[PDB]
Each structure stands twice: as C-alpha cells, then as structure tokens.
Design an enzyme around this catalytic site. Structure first.
Site, PDB file in Angstrom:
ATOM      1  N   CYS A  38     -10.243 -22.664 -17.344  1.00 43.66           N
ATOM      2  CA  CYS A  38     -11.471 -23.533 -17.253  1.00 43.66           C
ATOM      3  C   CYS A  38     -11.779 -24.447 -16.204  1.00 43.66           C
ATOM      4  O   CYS A  38     -12.426 -24.684 -15.420  1.00 43.66           O
ATOM      5  CB  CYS A  38     -12.046 -23.793 -18.598  1.00 43.66           C
ATOM      6  SG  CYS A  38     -10.895 -24.833 -19.244  1.00 43.66           S
ATOM      7  N   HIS A  81     -12.623 -28.617 -22.637  1.00 45.68           N
ATOM      8  CA  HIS A  81     -13.094 -27.628 -21.703  1.00 45.68           C
ATOM      9  C   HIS A  81     -13.679 -28.048 -20.672  1.00 45.68           C
ATOM     10  O   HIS A  81     -14.596 -29.104 -20.467  1.00 45.68           O
ATOM     11  CB  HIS A  81     -13.751 -26.486 -22.159  1.00 45.68           C
ATOM     12  CG  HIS A  81     -13.076 -25.370 -23.099  1.00 45.68           C
ATOM     13  ND1 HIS A  81     -12.981 -25.903 -24.275  1.00 45.68           N
ATOM     14  CD2 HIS A  81     -12.495 -24.257 -22.968  1.00 45.68           C
ATOM     15  CE1 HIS A  81     -12.177 -24.816 -25.136  1.00 45.68           C
ATOM     16  NE2 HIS A  81     -11.994 -23.679 -24.083  1.00 45.68           N
ATOM     17  N   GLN A  93     -13.305 -16.145 -17.025  1.00 49.40           N
ATOM     18  CA  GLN A  93     -11.925 -16.396 -17.010  1.00 49.40           C
ATOM     19  C   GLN A  93     -10.751 -15.652 -17.936  1.00 49.40           C
ATOM     20  O   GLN A  93      -9.639 -15.643 -17.818  1.00 49.40           O
ATOM     21  CB  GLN A  93     -11.758 -17.868 -17.631  1.00 49.40           C
ATOM     22  CG  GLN A  93     -11.942 -18.150 -18.929  1.00 49.40           C
ATOM     23  CD  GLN A  93     -11.916 -19.428 -19.410  1.00 49.40           C
ATOM     24  OE1 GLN A  93     -10.951 -19.920 -19.731  1.00 49.40           O
ATOM     25  NE2 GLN A  93     -12.825 -20.515 -19.134  1.00 49.40           N
ATOM     26  N   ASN A 144     -20.671 -22.132 -16.903  1.00 50.85           N
ATOM     27  CA  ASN A 144     -19.380 -21.904 -17.737  1.00 50.85           C
ATOM     28  C   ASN A 144     -18.722 -20.996 -16.886  1.00 50.85           C
ATOM     29  O   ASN A 144     -19.300 -20.250 -15.883  1.00 50.85           O
ATOM     30  CB  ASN A 144     -19.588 -21.560 -18.932  1.00 50.85           C
ATOM     31  CG  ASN A 144     -18.366 -22.153 -19.880  1.00 50.85           C
ATOM     32  OD1 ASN A 144     -17.138 -22.255 -19.323  1.00 50.85           O
ATOM     33  ND2 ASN A 144     -18.682 -22.471 -21.083  1.00 50.85           N
TER      34      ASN A 144
HETATM   35  C1  LIG Z   1      -9.897 -24.059 -20.456  1.00 44.77           C
HETATM   36  N1  LIG Z   1      -9.873 -22.796 -20.493  1.00 44.77           N
HETATM   37  C2  LIG Z   1      -9.001 -24.796 -21.549  1.00 44.77           C
HETATM   38  N2  LIG Z   1      -9.065 -26.276 -21.139  1.00 44.77           N
HETATM   39  C3  LIG Z   1      -8.418 -27.104 -20.278  1.00 44.77           C
HETATM   40  O1  LIG Z   1      -7.856 -26.554 -19.525  1.00 44.77           O
HETATM   41  C4  LIG Z   1      -8.659 -28.626 -20.366  1.00 44.77           C
HETATM   42  C5  LIG Z   1      -9.546 -29.341 -19.489  1.00 44.77           C
HETATM   43  C6  LIG Z   1      -9.346 -30.756 -19.452  1.00 44.77           C
HETATM   44  S1  LIG Z   1     -10.641 -31.428 -20.456  1.00 44.77           S
HETATM   45  O2  LIG Z   1     -11.822 -31.372 -19.729  1.00 44.77           O
HETATM   46  O3  LIG Z   1     -10.668 -30.966 -21.538  1.00 44.77           O
HETATM   47  C7  LIG Z   1     -10.133 -33.134 -20.222  1.00 44.77           C
HETATM   48  C8  LIG Z   1      -9.608 -33.430 -21.566  1.00 44.77           C
HETATM   49  C9  LIG Z   1      -9.039 -34.933 -21.628  1.00 44.77           C
HETATM   50  C10 LIG Z   1      -9.511 -35.623 -20.898  1.00 44.77           C
HETATM   51  C11 LIG Z   1      -9.965 -35.369 -19.665  1.00 44.77           C
HETATM   52  C12 LIG Z   1     -10.380 -33.928 -19.315  1.00 44.77           C
HETATM   53  C13 LIG Z   1     -11.085 -33.755 -18.078  1.00 44.77           C
HETATM   54  F1  LIG Z   1     -10.872 -34.816 -17.105  1.00 44.77           F
HETATM   55  F2  LIG Z   1     -10.590 -32.428 -17.475  1.00 44.77           F
HETATM   56  F3  LIG Z   1     -12.265 -33.785 -18.064  1.00 44.77           F
HETATM   57  C14 LIG Z   1      -8.014 -30.611 -19.753  1.00 44.77           C
HETATM   58  N3  LIG Z   1      -7.384 -29.209 -20.244  1.00 44.77           N
HETATM   59  C15 LIG Z   1      -8.666 -24.411 -22.820  1.00 44.77           C
HETATM   60  C16 LIG Z   1      -7.553 -24.452 -21.739  1.00 44.77           C
END
Ligand SMILES: *C(=N)C1(NC(=O)[C@@H]2C[C@@H](S(=O)(=O)c3ccccc3C(F)(F)F)CN2)CC1
Length: 219
Positions: A26, A166, A20, A186
C-alpha cells in the site's frame, strides 16, 4: 480562495488503479501515485511508476521499509532521492512479492528532490496542499470491515480511529449531498469502493486519521 471541489483525475494527473494483491505494498502504491501526479504536473506525461522498484530496493533498516511486509511513503520518497531515480512500471513491473533489487538508471523515469510533510491532523493544510500541489500521500485507519462494505456516498463509520494502518492517495475533495469528503485512490483494483476510490469524511475532526501523516514529493 481555494476551489470548492478538486479532482486531479480531471486534469490527467492520476494513473489507472492498481491491484496490490497479497503483498503489503500500500505504501509503495501511495508513494508512486503522489510522484506520478508531480511528474505529470512537471513534464506533461502521465506515467505509472514502479511500486515494485520501491518494494525490492528499500527493504532494509536504512529506510525501515519491509517490502511486502509494509513500509512508509516518506521513506519511499527518501529512497528515490538517495537512489537518484525510480523506474516506470512498464520496465519494472509489479510482482506482489519481494525480489532482488534490479534498478537500472538507464530506465529512470522520474526523480525526487525532496518531500514535504503537512502538520499532523491539519485538514485545512491537506485541503490547501491538494488544491495547490497535487495528489497527497496519507495514512488512514482502513482496518474496519465497513471500509470494504463501502460502495458510494461518504464513508464516516464511527468505529474509525486515529490509529492508521494503510497508505493511500488523496486525489481531490468536495462536498457530496451536503457532506464534505476527501477523494481517496486505493490499490485494491477497480472492484474496491467506487471503481477503486472511496470518498472519506472531511472536516470531521481528522476522521480515520486521514490528515495525521500527509506527505508529497517534489520532482
Ligand atoms: C499496506 N498494504 C499496509 N500498511 C502499511 O504498509 C503501513 C503504511 C504506513 S501508515 O500509513 O500506516 C502509517 C502508520 C503510522 C504512522 C505513519 C504512517 C504513514 F506515515 F505512513 F502514514 C505504515 N505501514 C498493510 C501493509
């Protein structure tokens, strides 16, 4: 009864590990990885799907994705549904930056009709889905340095929390030296973990939030 061990790599349902870079994509890699599994299970072809198509084309309040600023797998799937398709990586390659959307339906390589969300925190449900449906998109708490110290064995750092950050892909499960694990793909390239993968503790009370936010698409 469910199999004791699953590894979708062995069924040719998992594409090469992606990198990435500095873009917060991610979520997009996790989403395409789940859809790649379904595409292989339906068509018999293993094709890398365009994370960049997701980054460029769902960066708006309608989806609440922010391109390289982060996003959600379920909203990726909703875009693919609304858009009527997604391109292959080969025709819409990864740039690790936000770009103007240039989706072209003549280059559609997959579709999504709907998606399924599993019950929050339910590792039994995640096991059943991985066994019977395919690779499953999940969120984890991957914010601790020990996650990047990991090389082998089963990751089970007591400083993990349920506060996820993530998106990654669960491609299997099993038990390694008496410790149950989830097999996680990943998007940090082959130098991450064990050739791009990490085995994360399974059945330890939703450790790192791994079963909090599980989803998978249907073609
Ligand atoms: C990836 N490089 C990065 N993270 C994201 O874009 C995150 C992914 C999702 S999450 O998996 O963290 C998430 C958080 C809170 C509730 C639900 C989720 C879900 F549904 F995606 F799993 C949100 N942003 C660092 C940019």
């Amino acid at each position: 009864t469910l199999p004791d061990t699953v590894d979708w790599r062995e069924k040719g349902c998992v594409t090469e590990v992606k990198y990435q870079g500095s873009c917060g994509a991610c979520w997009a890699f996790s989403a395409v990885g789940a859809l790649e599994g379904q595409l292989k299970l339906k068509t018999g072809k293993l094709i890398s799907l365009s994370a960049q198509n997701l980054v460029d084309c769902s960066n708006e309040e309608k989806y609440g994705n922010k391109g390289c600023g982060g996003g959600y797998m379920t909203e990726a799937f909703q875009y693919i549904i609304d858009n009527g398709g997604i391109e292959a990586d080969a025709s819409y390659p990864y740039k690790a930056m936000d770009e103007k959307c240039h989706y072209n339906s003549k280059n559609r390589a997959a579709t999504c009709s709907r998606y399924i969300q599993l019950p929050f925190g339910d590792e039994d449900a995640l096991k059943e889905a991985v066994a019977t449906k395919g690779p499953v998109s999940v969120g984890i708490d991957a914010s601790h340095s020990s996650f990047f110290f990991y090389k082998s064995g089963v990751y089970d750092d007591p400083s993990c929390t349920g506060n996820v950050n993530h998106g990654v892909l669960v491609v299997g499960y099993g038990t390694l030296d008496g410790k149950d694990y989830w097999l996680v793909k990943n998007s940090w390239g082959l130098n991450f973990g064990d050739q791009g993968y990490i085995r994360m503790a399974r059945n330890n009370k939703n450790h790192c939030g791994i079963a909090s936010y599980c989803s998978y698409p249907e073609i």
